Design a protein around this ligand. Sequence first.
Ligand SMILES: CC(C)[C@H](N)C(=O)O
Ligand SMILES: [Zn+2]
Length: 918
Amino acid sequence: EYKDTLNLNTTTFSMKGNLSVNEPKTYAKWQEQQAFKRMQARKDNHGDFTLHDGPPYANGHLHLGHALNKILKDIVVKREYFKGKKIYYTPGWDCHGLPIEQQILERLEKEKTSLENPTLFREKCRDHAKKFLEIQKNEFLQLGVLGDFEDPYKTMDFKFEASIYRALVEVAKKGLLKERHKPIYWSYACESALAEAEVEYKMKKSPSIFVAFGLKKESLEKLKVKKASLVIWTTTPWTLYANVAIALKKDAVYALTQKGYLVAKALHEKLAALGVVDNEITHEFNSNDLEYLVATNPLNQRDSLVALGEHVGLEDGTGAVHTAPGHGEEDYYLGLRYNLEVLMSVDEKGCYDEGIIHNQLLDESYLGEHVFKAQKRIIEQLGDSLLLEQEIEHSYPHCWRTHKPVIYRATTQWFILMDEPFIQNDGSQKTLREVALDAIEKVEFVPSSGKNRLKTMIENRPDWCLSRQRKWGVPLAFFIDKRTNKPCFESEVLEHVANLFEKKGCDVWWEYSVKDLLPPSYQEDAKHYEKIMHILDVWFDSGSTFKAVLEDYHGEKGQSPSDVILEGSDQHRGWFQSSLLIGCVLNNQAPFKKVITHGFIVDEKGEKMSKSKGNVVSLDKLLKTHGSDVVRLWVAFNDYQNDLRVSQTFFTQTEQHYKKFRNTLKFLLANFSDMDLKNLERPHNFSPLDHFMLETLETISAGVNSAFEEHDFVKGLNILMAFVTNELSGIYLDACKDSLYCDSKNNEKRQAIQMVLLATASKLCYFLAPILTHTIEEVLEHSQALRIFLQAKDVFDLKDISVSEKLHLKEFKKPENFEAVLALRSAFNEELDRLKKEGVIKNSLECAIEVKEKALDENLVEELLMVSFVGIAKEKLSETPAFTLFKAPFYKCPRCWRFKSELENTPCKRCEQVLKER
Ligand SMILES: CC(C)[C@H](N)C(=O)O
Ligand SMILES: [Zn+2]
C-alpha cells in the first residue's frame, strides 16, 4: 500500500469539541487576562459603540431568558469590536424593589420571625442583592460573554442612589412631580401603591351581580310612576358600601318595565333574556330627566344620587353604573363633579376599618374583614334586591411579586404628570406625553413593529405614580414645610441631601434627624419640616440608569444616548418606557438610539416555563448538556425576535450545524498545516477554480456581513452554511483532494490551493468569532499558519482582512463564469447517479467523458466532474445531448486511485515522480 506516501495533512485541532471541559478553561483565561479591558485598550480603535445594559434584578439564579439576552448583547458587542470600534459595555444589576424585598418577607414569614428595624431590614435586602449579584455575574461569564463584569454598575451603590435622587430632583424642578389624591392600584399583600409595570393581568373568577336600587318616594312622585328601581351591574360587591351615585349615559333612553325595573333601553333585550328584568316595557324616559333623582342603597339604606356619567357604555351591564369614588378613578372624578362624599373605609391591608361604623356604611360584623372574603356574605345580605348572580372570568390586575389581586384605594401619592406642560431645554413648552411621542419617532426599533407597541402605551398611559410604601429603595427624600404643607424644592436643601446620599447612601434618611439632614442655614427652622418616607418605584431606579451610568461617568462607561439597548419585548411596558420618560424629562429625548428586542424562552409546546407547570429547564442543565458554544449557536441560528422553544430536536439540529462548521475548520487547518510560511510573502498563480472560489468567498462574505449588520444572524449563518456545504465542501474540497494528498509538497498548484484554504479559514474565523468565540479561539490556538497570516496572537487580534491584498490579486482580473461548467457537472452527476444504480460503475473516476461543447476548459471539466479522462474512449456507457460517457481506458493507480495508470498495480506518471522525489 502507498497510504504512507501521501501527504499526512493533519492538525492538532480536534473534531470533538469537548465543550464542557474546554470552554470553562477559555472563559477563566479571559477573566484572568482581563480580555475586555484589553479590548477597550486596543491601540487602533476607530469609532465608538455604546451598548447600555438593562439591569436584571439581583435575586435568584439566572433563567434561560437572561442567557438569551446576554448572548445577543455579546454577539452585537463583539461584532462592533471586530469591526474595529472602541466598545463600551458596563453590565449592571437592579438591586432595590419588591423583586428583592419580597424574597426577604417570604423568608421572614417562613422562619416565623419579623424585622421592624428599617436599617437592619434594608441591610438584609442589601446582603441578598450582593449575594445573587455575584452568583449571576459568574453565571453570565459561563456563557462566554465579555463586558466590564469586574466593574459593573449597581443601583445600591451609594453614588448610584444619589444619581437616582438627582434624577428625581430634575423632574421636581421642572414642575412634573406633584401630589394627587385618587384611587390607584393597591396591593394589600405588600401594603403599597403600584403602577402599571408592577401589575400582571391574569384571568380570575369573580361574582357578577345585578342589583336593584329603588327610587325614593319623592323621586317616584317626580317621575310620576308607582314603582321604579335602577338596576346596576357590578363585579365588586365589596365596593357597594361606598356607593354615592348611579351614573347614566347622557341623553339616552331608559326603559321602565312592568315590574318596575329601570335599565337602558338599548340593553333591555339582553337583560330580559338573562332573566335580570321582565320583558314588558311600560314607559321610556330620557336620562336627562332622571338626573338628580335619588335612590336607596339596598345594602345600607343610604341615598344614591342619579347622575350622568361621561362615556357610560351600553355594550355590557345595564347602562346604570354603581359609582364608588373611593375605589374607582372615573367614579372619583364624577363624585367631585357632583360634590359627593368620597367613601373609603378599606385599610392598607384590604380590610374594612372603623369608617364603616362611624359612617353607617356596612354592618359592624364586617369590621376587619378582607374585602374579597366579605363578598359572599354581602351578596346574601342583598336579599330581594339581588336580581341575578353569575360567576364570570375576566382579566384582572395582580401584584407582580406577591401574585395576589390588587384593589383600588383613594390615597394621596406622588406622580410624574404626563399632560402638564413644562419648559423644554430649548425654551419651548410641551407636555411629557408630547415629548415622548416625538422622541419615539427618532428611535430605530428592531423589529420596526416595536415602535408602535411603545407608542400606543405612551399615547394611553396615565400619570405615573412614583411613591411606594416599602423600605428597600431610594426615598422620595423631600421635606414638607408644615407652615406651607408643600414640599421644599430649594436647591440648597436638595443638593445637601444628594451629597449625603453620595457619601453615606440612603440609610441616613431613616437614621438622621431632620436637623442633621438640613443645610446649616436651615437648622434653626428644622422644627417646621417633616420627611416624606415613601420610596421610589423601582422602575424609576432602572429608568434612571442612563443618567447614573452614561451621563454621571461622562462617557467613561459609554455615551448618552446609547447606540443600542437590547431586551425582551416585555420591556416596552417596563425599562424602555421608564427610561424613555425620564430621558424625555431630563434631555427631551430618548436615552437610546436603537432598540433591539427578543422573545421569551418557552418550552416544547410554546408555553412559558414555571415550576408550577413543571416544564422548567435550568440554565446549568442546558450548558452541561450542550456546551455554551452550541447554546450560543442555537440563539444566533434562530428567530430570536419571537419566542424560542427549548426541545431536544432543535438542539440536535444546532449540534449538527456546529459539527459541520467545526469539521470544515478542521479540514482547512489540516490541509495548510504543512505549508511553508514563505508562501505568505510571495504571489501565487491561481487556477480558474481557485479564482472561482476566491470570488465566491468575497461574494458570500459581503452577504454574511450585510445580514449580520441587520442583526439577521439566521440569514447570514444560512449564507455561510450554504457556502461551506456547497461551493467549499461539495465542489472545491472534493476537486482539490487529489492534489492536497497526492501532489508533491513543493507543487506550485497545491501551494496555491493551500493559500485559498487559508483565506477561507480566515473569513470563517472573522464571521464566526462573535458567535462561536471559544471555538475560534481554539482554532487560532492550533494553527500557527493562521496566526501568522492574520497577524493575530489570539481571537481578539482578528480583523476583516482584504483577501485581494494578502493574496496579491490583480485589480482588473475578470471574474470567472462557471455557469456552463456547473450545469455540465450537475447533469453528469445525475447521469452518474443512474449508472451507480444499475451497477455499471462505482465512482466518477472510473469514467471518461467526451463533451459536445468544445468551448469548455477540459482540465476544468476533469477537475469539476472528477473523471479520470476527458475525451473519446472505447467502451461506451451512456450518451446525452451534452456528453458521452465511457469507461476510462486506464488501470486504477494504486497510490492516488485515479484511473490514469498504463499498467496494472503500477503508480501513474504523477505518482511515480512524487515517489522518486529527492
Ligand atoms: C430594568 C429591567 C431589566 C428589570 N430589572 C427586569 O429584569 O425586568
Ligand atoms: Zn497515481
